[PDB]
Amino acid sequence: MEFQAVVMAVPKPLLPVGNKPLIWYPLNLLERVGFEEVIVVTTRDVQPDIVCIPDMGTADSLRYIYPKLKTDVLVLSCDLITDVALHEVVDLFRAYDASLAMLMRKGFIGVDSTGKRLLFMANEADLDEELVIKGSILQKHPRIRFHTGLVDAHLYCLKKYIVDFLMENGSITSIRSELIPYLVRKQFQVRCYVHIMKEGLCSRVSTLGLYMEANRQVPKLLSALC
Amino acid sequence: PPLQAVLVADSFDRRFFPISKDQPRVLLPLANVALIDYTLEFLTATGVQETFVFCCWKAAQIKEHLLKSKWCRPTSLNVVRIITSELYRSLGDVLRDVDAKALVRSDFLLVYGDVISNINITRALEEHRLRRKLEKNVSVMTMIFKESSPSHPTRCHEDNVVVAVDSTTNRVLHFQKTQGLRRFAFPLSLFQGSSDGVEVRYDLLDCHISICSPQVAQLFTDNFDYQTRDDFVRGLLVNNQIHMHVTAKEYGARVSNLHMYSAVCADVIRRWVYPLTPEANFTDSTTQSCTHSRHNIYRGPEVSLGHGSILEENVLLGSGTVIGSNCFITNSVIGPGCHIGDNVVLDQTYLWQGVRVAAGAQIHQSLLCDNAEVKERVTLKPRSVLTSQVVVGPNITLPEGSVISLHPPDAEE
Amino acid sequence: DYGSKVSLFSHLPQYSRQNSLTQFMSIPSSVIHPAMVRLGLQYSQGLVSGSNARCIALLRALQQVIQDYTTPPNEELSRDLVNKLKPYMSFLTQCRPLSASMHNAIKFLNKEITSVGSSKREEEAKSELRAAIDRYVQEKIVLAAQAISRFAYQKISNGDVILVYGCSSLVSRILQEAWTEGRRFRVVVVDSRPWLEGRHTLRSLVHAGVPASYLLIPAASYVLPEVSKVLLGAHALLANGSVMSRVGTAQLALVARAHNVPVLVCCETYKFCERVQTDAFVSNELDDPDDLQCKRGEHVALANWQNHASLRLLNLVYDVTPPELVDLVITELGMIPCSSVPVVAR
Amino acid sequence: GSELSERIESFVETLKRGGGPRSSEEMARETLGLLRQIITDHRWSNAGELMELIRREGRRMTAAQPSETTVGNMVRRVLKIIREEYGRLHGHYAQLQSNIIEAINELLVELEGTMENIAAQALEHIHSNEVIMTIGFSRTVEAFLKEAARKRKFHVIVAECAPFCQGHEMAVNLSKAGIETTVMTDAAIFAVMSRVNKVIIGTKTILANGALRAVTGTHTLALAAKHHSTPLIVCAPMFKLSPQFPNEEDSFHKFVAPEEVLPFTEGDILEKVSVHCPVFDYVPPELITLFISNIGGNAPSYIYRLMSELYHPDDHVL
Amino acid sequence: IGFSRTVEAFLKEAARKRKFHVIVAECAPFCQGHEMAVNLSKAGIETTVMTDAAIFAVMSRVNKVIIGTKTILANGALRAVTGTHTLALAAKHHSTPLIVCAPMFKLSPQFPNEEDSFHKFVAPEEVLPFTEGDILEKVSVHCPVFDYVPPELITLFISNIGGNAPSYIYRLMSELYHPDDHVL
């Protein structure tokens, strides 16, 4: 096929967000454009086709399920309530033949003038004082746009050789914290692209405030979803 | 209120100091026209009605040359005032003098004496005034840039800068040079203090043209440690706001070194600074008349071109020049009164007035000053500067980077 | 369709670059192979625009599809492969109209598939199909280009002034090979809005050390008197001797004839078409009219052209060139007159 | 006093450093006003010194910008008026100034009337269901089309110039009045042939042998019209008649900065690439069919006859 | 111009789908074009007819010219009815393409070798009536029915194998007739 739809989720997945389980929303989003096979990794809380496997971080589970996958893997998060069409992010991976497709929404990363290619990325913790950019990136890309108020949906379209490389080394444990920055710094062929919606929800439930905001935001989405 | 401008004739740096022992930098001819004439023409075309000229060293020559220019005629719309003082040592000194003399009363332009541009400031000044009035005098400087490519020949490594601006409202937040720098660094204040556009631009050419404010001189005088404008703009964004503007269809550059001088001269020859062209005769001088031909070939009166000579590309020839037979001149500028020999090959070579070249000489990418002489069977390597009155003999070859001057300490003799 | 078309071109589609149809499609595409949908997305986005590049990409996608194709039970491969490939061709045509090279490639592939033996094993069928496709690609592109360049090298002399228009992978190869062999000359590059594809070949010539000049098509009359020869590319060869190419070619040939300048056309034998055309109205391709907008001065004059009912924007791409304005045609088999291409093509 | 001189240098500077009035009619009107003011507030006891002064001012104006042959025509017309008045009077020295002022005023009135005179002849050469093509932006062809379209209905195709896309403004202005215009590039000019019934265009000036100077790309249009045997009618007023034959004229076209053709942000390839951006071009007289002016349509072979009256032969060199 | 069955079938077949205008030119000796004009008029085609003297006068709004022929020479020339040479000249002057649809059996492998029998002559009665008077003994009247059209005035040739250029006739001749039988 073309994607594997990894829905890694390692009773948080069964939280009553909008009178439905928290894991239902990513599953419902996936079961709207094909995706007849789904691989779900979680603990002993399991209840369209779903393949569960009780088991850690993200790269460890990806290596655990490495034999099962045979093509590109679509990494999805357990807590993700979005109303954006997946085609907007799939087109970047398809037309440009990129190695990674990423999705952000407005509330450090660097994008070019078009605002669809990822050039630089560094969190506040990694850098001590000074944000340093190599002269080569500025030579190839003169204008760089920086965004500081973006959130991450944990939606990545990985390739096959990326997973093959991740398999042989266990140093990387969290994908979001070690894999994407590695690809960003390695390309300066490896290409990384990002997509910004700027008008949707892209809500990732990870705190009490986000929990209550998601509760407020469910009903109008559900009025059209169902 | 009428528009005013301040012109700094003396360049306090010594970049052009194999040759400046006889003539100032402003009087160096680019296309047989002085750089100060180019700056005065640009100021007059942009709308300046009063220009202040500050001269520090070799002031007599500049003063006597300005009076002969058309800008000093009674029927002029741009009054030029010449101020001479031997105590000047940097731009900060002249700015403090202007502050003490109360010469300026409103927004004025601060440009050097070797700036060649055709930018008409009529919208950048308007938005600068609008944002000064709206916020009640928080913006003090509106620097002018030009969008270009980092690989352009007009972007010298000694005049390459990287800045971080706000996309919403054009305002400079960081300014630093890139001389011998590989990994540039930007402070965290921009990202962690504000938002809505913190983009970084590395495609801007420094035109060295700025729109100043009456309080800029007072800020310069308050701190008795400012010498150049770069130090002022670096120290202001340490605590008043500095904004910026970008042009896309016009041209602007300041001659600082030999490489940039050659690049600007080549751009001028190729009509990149239209309408400021050699055949336009903006100086209103009878001895600088010229006619435009195919392949950007310019010929003046009494060219006396010989038989067999080929002008392959854009060539500027002065009045009274003499050209032999079987010559080959391309991408070269020849001053008035020159006497070229036979079988002489010129490529990217600049010749001033009074230069005599013997037959069989091969000159490539060299510069010859006034009254320079070259004997027969002499080959000049690229980037070989010859000062005024050089009598280099025959059967000699100058290596790359060779400089010959009458003064003993200046390399060779 | 997008916008309103003119009366003279009401029989031709006019699509939009932003009206991508992949939105109403399943992400793990099954009705259409992922290679075809990726190729269609690339074609719509304009990533691939060369005449040979599009054919190469189409053949590569077809080879990829053949590699991962399984035969349905109780059904011959030769009887169903064409029926399965037809919707892919329809989808590709919907994304962007095809060219002569793509039509020839798909016709050759259909002929190959129909000739596959019934008793041949499926893996053998796939392997031989891939080998035949690779051999066809080789002999029709990389063996023809060398022969065309060798033939054209004899017509280039020192001191010549060659004028070229647009972007062509064959003309550029000829010029680079001629410069590398030892010929010394200069090239003239002509561009027209809004594609401005000649900048690519200008940059290629600059990086190769060949002197070049740049100007627009309205000023070609000023530079033609100093031009010695005119070299132009061809997109398709018709059965009546005419040449189909970029829209800025026929008028360039006419002006060159008015200035008494020979016109040379280089094309391959696999681009021949069994069609007869006289004008660029019976068969043409219309692009996005929004590309005609220009940023001149401080605003765009055609920002709201759709608000005017009497305002129309026309975006012709191809045109025909009469044989009277063509002097020499160079193919992979030898130098021939323009009025003798049907004899050798068929 | 000094006001006349100040206006003279202001006019010279605004002619040299850049463009002046957008329309040529306003330029001619202000040139005539400047010449009248020069004649009025100057000290001249005889006609000869007045003609010498006028010739010197005309030479200065021509040297300011030789690409435009508009001020020189006014200078030549004023000189012809001076010569005619001198021949009428001497053939004196008392009422010459009043006659000159009256001649200038009547010339200005006629120049104002040329626009209506040209526009009044729109229905004769234009019929219904016709295809008309124009290149660039012209204030005379626009008036012609708008006057002809108020009683009939036809189709107009407008092609913009590649460096200066001024045809978009013409197309918008026409479509605002319901003409059903079309916008296309210069590349698709030969393709659009064989369907156009008539060609109506303007010109900057008209040469002596019937040739004319127009915007770039007009030569290709004329060649296509000749190839397809379509008529080519040019509408131009009487002040565009240049009394100089086409010489070598290496500077006939106006060359501008290569920024319009090639952007400055191309890179390092700009140091070894020659870019030329001519504005005007030369059209041979054999490719023109009719010449429409304010006194009626005339053949290209009547240009010398039309010029002989306007300008004295001794003033051709000015 | 004239009456051609092939041209009539070509024109009447495309009238069902599209509507156009047809201009028919008569023939001065025998007005056989009027029969074609009325046949096309009784087809919903909206045709018109006129004399032979207005061929060049109305050669401005005509976008395409389709005519027949009696035979095709070895150099691509044609032998059509009289007055077709003027039509071809007008089409060339106005750059209007002239395309001729002729069958494959009208291909004659011969050249116009000054035979002088190219235009057969008939009785001068059709031109000048016998009842003119006594002036018939001095006036010499010639009534040719065919004209010579050079191949340079032909744009396309419709055949059963598709439209062919006038320069492709020799290729068909090489495969149609043996070169030893050209003399017969």
Residue numbers in the entry:
A (entry chain J): 1 to 10, 24 to 60, 73 to 80, 84 to 135, 157 to 237, 297 to 334
B (entry chain B): 41 to 279, 285 to 458
C (entry chain F): 172 to 517
D (entry chain C): 8 to 98, 125 to 351
E (entry chain D): 168 to 351
What text comes from the article?
To explore the functional consequences of this rearrangement, we mutated δL516 and δF443 independently to alanine (δL516A and δF443A, respectively). Strikingly, we observed that the δL516A mutation resulted in a decrease in FAM-ISRIB binding affinity by almost an order of magnitude (eightfold), whereas the δF443A mutation reduced FAM-ISRIB binding by twofold. Similarly, the δL516A mutation strongly decreased nucleotide exchange activity, whereas the activity of δF443A was only slightly reduced. Thus in the absence of the steric clash driven by δL516, the δF443 rotamer and eIF2B as a whole default to the I-state orientation. To further test this prediction, we determined a cryo-EM structure of eIF2B δL516A. After two-dimensional (2D) and three-dimensional (3D) classification, we generated a single consensus structure of the eIF2B δL516A decamer at a resolution of 2.9 Å, with most side chain density clearly visible. Consistent with our predictions, δL516A exhibited a ‘wings-down’ I-state-like conformation. The two tetramer subcomplexes underwent a rocking motion that changes the angle between them by 11.6° relative to the ISRIB-bound A-state. Close examination of the δL516A switch-helix confirmed that δF443 defaulted to an I-state ‘up’ rotameric position. Critically, in the δL516A structure, δR517 also formed the I-state salt-bridged conformation, reinforcing the notion that the salt bridge and rotamer elements of the switch-helix are functionally coupled.
